[PDB]
Amino acid sequence: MENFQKVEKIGEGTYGVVYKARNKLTGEVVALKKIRTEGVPSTAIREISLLKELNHPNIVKLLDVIHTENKLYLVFEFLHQDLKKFMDASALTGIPLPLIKSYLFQLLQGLAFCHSHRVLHRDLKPQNLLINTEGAIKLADFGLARAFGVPVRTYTHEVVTLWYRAPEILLGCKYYSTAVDIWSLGCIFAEMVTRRALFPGDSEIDQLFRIFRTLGTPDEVVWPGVTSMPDYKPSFPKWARQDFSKVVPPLDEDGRSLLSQMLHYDPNKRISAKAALAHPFFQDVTKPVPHLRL
Ligand SMILES: Nc1nc(Nc2ccc(S(N)(=O)=O)cc2)sc1C(=O)Nc1c(F)cccc1F
């Protein structure tokens, strides 16, 4: 705007443009997010203003929420790399399990905190997870779908990723549950392990059918009420669930068990972030430091 000398465009947020900027008056480097118009709900945004009070080591600190010119500016502490770039960087050898384990454990702590404060992220994806040289990983973005929602793209015609979207969202559920974040983190967990997106759908139905072909088409047995969902069709194909051992090798049984619980069809059966933190997969969790190329 003026108190900020844009350094580089960090990228394209699903609400606007994110810039790496420097506070010309404080000298601190931050991530500046400019929001997409004709006023925007001032009562809805209050949520955001409440997010400044959500302080946790695994959540990106929201330093400021500014309203001026129908442009909403969000100032976040700046982190040097997102998880997608890091995974791509490690694609050849894979992220080491101890690090995968540490990031998973930290993201769960972050989610446990948000969920206990009644905040849902709703759009977890590798690109929204930020890491530093210290070995920490933080939740960035946060949907803010109740105070904003999901556009016909993001802010300027851009292919929204559906890969980490929970089945109840794909089936037209209106009320989000904190369980949707768990599903997404589960997908991200499998992705770090295998170095392949778990459910790479390029359309809502393709996304849904990819989930079904892998976990089996859900029914009233495994998911009471599923046939009552808004977009459920009795015409959906009936795929048998695939053996889970083929889904995430060579993840051990502790990891597979935790993953199956994070990917339970029924949201009420899906494990919470708090219980997952107590899962035996984390008995030997540590905090390695990643090899970061900045
Ligand atoms: N605070 C913050 N720091 C970032 N750093 C950063 C990100 C990616 C790379 S990369 N691609 O690895 O070179 C480097 C640095 S993005 C970001 C944020 O909060 N971002 C942000 C936002 F403002 C609103 C919605 C989603 C977001 F991810």
- Domains (ranges, CATH) in the chain? 1-80 (3.30.200.20), 81-291 (1.10.510.10)
Name residue 12's beta-bridge partners.
Answer: 17
Does residue 57 contact residue 136 with C-beta atoms inside 8 Å? yes
Q: Which atom of ligand 1 is nearest to the CA of 60?
A: 1
Nearest CA residue ID for atom 24, ligand 1? 141
36 CB-contact burial (10 Å; exposed 0-12 / middle 13-18 / buried 19+) = middle
Q: State this model's resolution in angstroms.
A: 2.1
Phi then psi dihedrals of residue 28, to 5 deg: -80, 140
Report the alpha-carbon distance of residue 146 to residue 168 in Å, rounded.
17
Element (H, E) at 34: strand 29-35
DSSP count for the chain of H helices, then E strands:
8, 8
Question: Tokens representing 11?
Answer: 């990228």
Determine whether the annotation assigns residue 2 to a binding site: no
Q: Which two tokens stand for residue 155?
A: 């802010």
Which of 1, 81, 57 minimizes the C-alpha distance to 33? 1
Using most ligand atoms within 8 A of CB, pick from 4, 7, 14, 18 the residue to mutate for ligand 1. Answer: 18
For residue 76, the surrounding DSSP H or E stretch is strand 71-77
Start-to-end CA span in the chain (Å):
26
Atom 21 of ligand 1, nearest CA residue: 141
Computed on alpha carbons and rounded to an integer, the radius of gyration of the chain in Å comes to: 19
Q: Please give the Cα distance from 217 to 214 (Å, whole number).
A: 8
Method: X-ray
Catalytically annotated residues: 123
Burial class of residue 25, CB neighbours in 10 A (0-12, 13-18, 19+):
exposed
Please give the number of the atom of ligand 1 that sits closest to the Cα of 81. 12
Peptide bond preceding 250 in cis form (omega within 30 of 0): yes
> Measuring CA to CA, how many Å separate 124 from each of 163, 183, 202, 258, 267?
10, 9, 17, 18, 17
Q: Is 287 exposed, middle or buried (0-12, 13-18, 19+ CB in 10 A)?
A: middle
Residue 82 CA, ligand 1 centroid: distance in Å: 7
192: its two tokens: 């770090």
- 230 token code pair: 């808004």
